[PDB]
Amino acid sequence: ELTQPPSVSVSPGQTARITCSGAPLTSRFTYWYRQKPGQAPVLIISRSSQGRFSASWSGTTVTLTIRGVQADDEADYYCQSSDTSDSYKMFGGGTKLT
């Protein structure tokens, strides 16, 4: 349904980059969230404009940067974007970072 990136490695305490392509993007923002191995998912986004990690509201991929943090961050990532008529959120084939 969604064009999610499969797997991308980490920079050695440097620049972080992800994509996630789709048709809405400029419609119902981004919304990420992470699935911990064998544990309940947790908060990433801090949307309010009508913490730590930010993104640019683009119509191509949007993207997301998790700063210069090498370790302490490795989980399965996703993306939830509402359709113009609140139909579905669509998700790809997961994002397993290393």
Binding site: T26, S49, W57
Partner: protein, 40 residues
């Protein structure tokens, strides 16, 4: 009496703002974009 009230208000509306700033040279070329956010 209805027609009297009709003419009094419009004549007063034309009178009011007569001594005020004329926006005759204000109307010019106009180039734009939309907002900082895409319609939210």
């Amino acid at each position: 009496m209805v027609e009297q009230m009709h003419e009094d208000i419009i004549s007063l509306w034309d009178q009011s703002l007569k001594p005020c700033v004329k926006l005759t040279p204000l109307c010019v070329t106009l180039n734009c974009n939309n907002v900082n956010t895409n319609n939210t």
